[PDB]
């Protein structure tokens, strides 16, 4: 993976292969061990979080001892954060996506612009939300978890592949 010197990580994060983190990739995985996936591209200005501390104060039996995870082809773009997103296969997060706490991001997840993810909501597969229309379950089969949106994600991943080699060569 492209372990960029500018990619600011924090804590024990046993990453995976092909997890090209771009410059200024501020993250945090200390209170929760976030394992990276295979085939993503952590862009600039991101924010990976782990175990929302006592500022919010979870006064509901804080005995978490649970680590975050990632998946394949789930490249998150700039602006968008990552508040412990239990992703999967090809769950791309576009610009300025306000990542929510308990959103088990399944496949075919196209996190649109300025779409604040729903806390404690099981993000099923094959669903792309609309921008202004929050929670729009539009394109139930067009944004299909496999062969349609994941195929488009692997197609967008090609530019990420060329950029992965280019960033590994430019550094």
């Amino acid at each position: 993976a492209v372990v960029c010197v500018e990619s600011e990580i924090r804590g024990d994060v046993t990453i995976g292969p092909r997890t090209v983190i771009h410059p200024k990739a501020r993250i945090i995985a200390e209170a929760g061990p976030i394992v990276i996936g295979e085939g993503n591209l952590i862009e600039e200005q991101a924010l990976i979080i782990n175990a929302h501390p006592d500022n919010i104060t979870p006064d509901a039996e804080d005995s978490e001892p649970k680590p975050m995870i990632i998946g394949t082809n789930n490249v998150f773009e700039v602006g968008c954060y990552s508040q412990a997103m239990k992703m999967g296969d090809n769950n791309v997060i576009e610009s300025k996506a306000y990542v929510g706490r308990n959103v088990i991001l399944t496949s075919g997840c196209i996190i649109g612009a300025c779409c604040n993810l729903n806390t404690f909501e099981v993000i099923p597969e094959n669903t792309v939300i609309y921008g202004a229309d929050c929670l729009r379950r539009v394109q139930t089969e067009r944004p299909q978890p496999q062969t349609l949106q994941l195929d488009f994600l692997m197609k967008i991943l090609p530019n990420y592949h060329h950029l992965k080699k280019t960033m590994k060569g430019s550094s």
Partner: protein, 165 residues
């Protein structure tokens, strides 16, 4: 030389950038336009918290978004997470803007607050395209826009001197 830029910026590929004199850049603007070229002009301005990344590879198999472009005496407010926007002369972005991929924002444009332009969303000239999705909100004047952009270049070269060394 004349571009009295800040010192807490972030970028790579020193020659890939293009920022002529009398410009005013701000801090925390992580513009990683290293691979593809970054084009800008004179008396232009940008603001903090704006990670204006470059468009794309520009040399893919089929089509690919070119290096970059910007205009003279333009202004880009705070949190402008822009990406792939050829700005014309006297353009004017807004706060928390989101420039869509492959957007040739023509001259005398006017972006809005928290406006999320989609990919390949062409914006007309002297027409403030705005809203959440792409929408030609209203029609912006010509004379007042040119005077406001000149005043913007003036204020940018008359305020950047302090608190930036």
């Amino acid at each position: 030389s004349g571009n009295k830029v800040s010192r807490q910026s972030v970028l790579c590929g020193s020659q890939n950038i293009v920022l002529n004199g009398k410009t005013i850049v701000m801090n925390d603007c992580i513009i990683r336009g290293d691979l593809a070229n970054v084009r800008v002009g004179r008396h232009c301005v940008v603001k903090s918290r704006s990670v204006i990344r470059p468009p794309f590879k520009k040399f893919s198999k089929g089509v690919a978004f070119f290096p970059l472009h910007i205009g003279d005496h333009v202004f880009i407010e705070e949190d402008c997470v822009v990406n792939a926007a050829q700005i014309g002369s006297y353009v004017h972005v807004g706060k928390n803007c989101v420039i869509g991929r492959r957007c040739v924002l023509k001259d005398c444009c006017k972006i809005l607050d928290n406006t999320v332009l989609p990919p390949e969303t062409v914006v007309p000239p002297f027409t403030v395209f705005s809203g959440c999705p792409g929408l030609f909100s209203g029609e912006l004047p010509e004379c007042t826009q040119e005077l406001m952009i000149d005043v913007t270049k003036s204020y940018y070269q008359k305020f950047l001197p302090l608190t930036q060394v």
